[PDB]
Design an enzyme around this catalytic site. Structure first.
Site, PDB file in Angstrom:
ATOM      1  N   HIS A 169       0.647  -1.524   0.021  1.00  0.00           N
ATOM      2  CA  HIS A 169       0.142   0.092   0.108  1.00  0.00           C
ATOM      3  C   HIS A 169       0.751   1.311  -0.039  1.00  0.00           C
ATOM      4  O   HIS A 169       0.452   2.335  -0.810  1.00  0.00           O
ATOM      5  CB  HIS A 169      -0.942   0.089   1.411  1.00  0.00           C
ATOM      6  N   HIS A 200       3.341  10.924   6.650  1.00  0.00           N
ATOM      7  CA  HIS A 200       2.533  10.648   7.976  1.00  0.00           C
ATOM      8  C   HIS A 200       3.453   9.766   9.009  1.00  0.00           C
ATOM      9  O   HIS A 200       4.293   8.997   8.567  1.00  0.00           O
ATOM     10  CB  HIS A 200       1.375   9.673   7.537  1.00  0.00           C
ATOM     11  N   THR A 229      -6.193   6.553   7.449  1.00  0.00           N
ATOM     12  CA  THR A 229      -6.682   6.956   6.116  1.00  0.00           C
ATOM     13  C   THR A 229      -6.833   5.950   5.174  1.00  0.00           C
ATOM     14  O   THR A 229      -6.975   5.944   4.064  1.00  0.00           O
ATOM     15  CB  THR A 229      -5.987   8.156   5.337  1.00  0.00           C
ATOM     16  N   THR A 230      -6.539   4.528   5.787  1.00  0.00           N
ATOM     17  CA  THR A 230      -6.604   3.172   5.014  1.00  0.00           C
ATOM     18  C   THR A 230      -7.242   2.350   5.831  1.00  0.00           C
ATOM     19  O   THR A 230      -7.459   2.607   7.112  1.00  0.00           O
ATOM     20  CB  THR A 230      -5.438   2.655   4.550  1.00  0.00           C
TER      21      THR A 230
HETATM   22  N1  LIG Z   1      -2.273   6.842   6.662  1.00  0.00           N
HETATM   23  S1  LIG Z   1      -2.467   6.848   8.428  1.00  0.00           S
HETATM   24  O1  LIG Z   1      -3.630   7.072   8.414  1.00  0.00           O
HETATM   25  O2  LIG Z   1      -1.166   7.356   8.711  1.00  0.00           O
HETATM   26  C1  LIG Z   1      -2.603   5.048   8.787  1.00  0.00           C
HETATM   27  C2  LIG Z   1      -3.052   4.078   7.975  1.00  0.00           C
HETATM   28  C3  LIG Z   1      -3.120   2.786   8.317  1.00  0.00           C
HETATM   29  C4  LIG Z   1      -2.477   2.379   9.669  1.00  0.00           C
HETATM   30  C5  LIG Z   1      -1.855   3.270  10.336  1.00  0.00           C
HETATM   31  C6  LIG Z   1      -1.626   4.853   9.966  1.00  0.00           C
HETATM   32  S2  LIG Z   1      -0.833   2.520  11.853  1.00  0.00           S
HETATM   33  O3  LIG Z   1      -1.557   3.131  13.077  1.00  0.00           O
HETATM   34  O4  LIG Z   1       0.539   2.616  11.588  1.00  0.00           O
HETATM   35  N2  LIG Z   1      -1.623   0.964  11.242  1.00  0.00           N
HETATM   36  C7  LIG Z   1      -2.424   1.122  10.535  1.00  0.00           C
HETATM   37  O5  LIG Z   1      -2.956   0.301  10.081  1.00  0.00           O
HETATM   38 ZN   LIG Z   2      -0.711   7.503   5.936  1.00  0.00          ZN
END
Ligand SMILES: NS(=O)(=O)c1ccc2c(c1)S(=O)(=O)NC2=O
Ligand SMILES: [Zn+2]
Length: 258
Positions: free
Chosen positions: A62, A117, A196-197
């Site tokens: 991803h 991020h 966001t995913t």
């Molecule tokens: N894109 S984001 O919101 O920083 C984000 C998306 C997915 C995930 C994360 C951040 S995480 O907390 O490292 N574990 C995850 O599955």
């Molecule tokens: Zn992210």
């Protein structure tokens, strides 16, 4: 049929497996700078990455994550809208197929070339796993990337991407200093949101920096050489791995500056 960013498994499809996709505090959002309000109650933001210890870089199909050793209180984010101490666990980016798109958050509808991020978890919950079960479990520091002069501090990341081209691949990545990815100013906008995913959990306090960092056309081009697919599979370039802005609903975006 796993979630992704394509026509048949993209953002518009996520709600089927993750109904919270249509929740009350989803991210990203468009930041309307005129509607955002200065908040006097915000404390000074503290980004202490001096003792940060990176360990590995991974292509998870991803995006690519630079993971850190978070077993001790080392790289931490505090202050600003945050209550307590949040520990850095990983950082990654979202980018586009062209310089005109790529960021997840937008500013007055403007899309940047990419967005960084830096993910942190609230230490009051003991571990990341427990944190993602809390409404204030995570804090993500978002930084926009625009194309212009190169960012020296990002080159080490750029140069190791050839070794993690496909999904599932990882490589040692120690001694990387995330301080080299920060802009001069820490002015920011903040609001309560989500990952966001998928799983799109609503446990995030978002802190999005106003000042973007500049990266070179060559550096972002290398992000675009990565693959969403695993080794030996048809090549699908890892581009446009961003989610579009979601409904603000009952939320107010606060600014740390006047
Ligand atoms: N894109 S984001 O919101 O920083 C984000 C998306 C997915 C995930 C994360 C951040 S995480 O907390 O490292 N574990 C995850 O599955
Ligand atoms: Zn992210």
């Amino acid at each position: 049929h796993h979630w992704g960013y394509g026509k048949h498994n993209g953002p518009e499809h996520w709600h089927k497996d993750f109904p919270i996709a249509k929740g009350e505090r989803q991210s990203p959002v468009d930041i309307d700078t005129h509607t955002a309000k200065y908040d006097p109650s915000l404390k000074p933001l503290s980004v202490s990455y001096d003792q940060a210890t990176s360990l590995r870089i991974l292509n998870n199909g991803h995006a690519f994550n630079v993971e850190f050793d978070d077993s001790q209180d080392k790289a931490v984010l505090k202050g600003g809208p945050l209550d307590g101490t949040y520990r850095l666990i990983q950082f990654h980016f979202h980018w586009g197929s062209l310089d005109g798109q790529g960021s997840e958050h937008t500013v007055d509808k403007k899309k940047y070339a990419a967005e960084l991020h830096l993910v942190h978890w609230n230490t009051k919950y003991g571990d990341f796993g427990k944190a993602v079960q809390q409404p204030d479990g995570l804090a993500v520091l978002g930084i926009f990337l625009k194309v212009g002069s190169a960012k020296p501090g990002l080159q080490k990341v750029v140069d190791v991407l050839d070794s993690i081209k496909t999904k599932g691949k990882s490589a040692d990545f120690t001694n990387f200093d995330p301080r080299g990815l920060l802009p001069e100013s820490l002015d920011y906008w903040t609001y309560p949101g989500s990952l966001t995913t998928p799983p799109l959990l609503e446990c995030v306090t978002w802190i999005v920096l106003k000042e973007p960092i500049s990266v070179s056309s060559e550096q972002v081009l290398k992000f675009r050489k990565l693959n969403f697919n695993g080794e030996g599979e048809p090549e699908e370039l890892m581009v446009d791995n961003w989610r579009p802005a979601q409904p603000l609903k009952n939320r107010q975006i606060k600014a740390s500056f006047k």
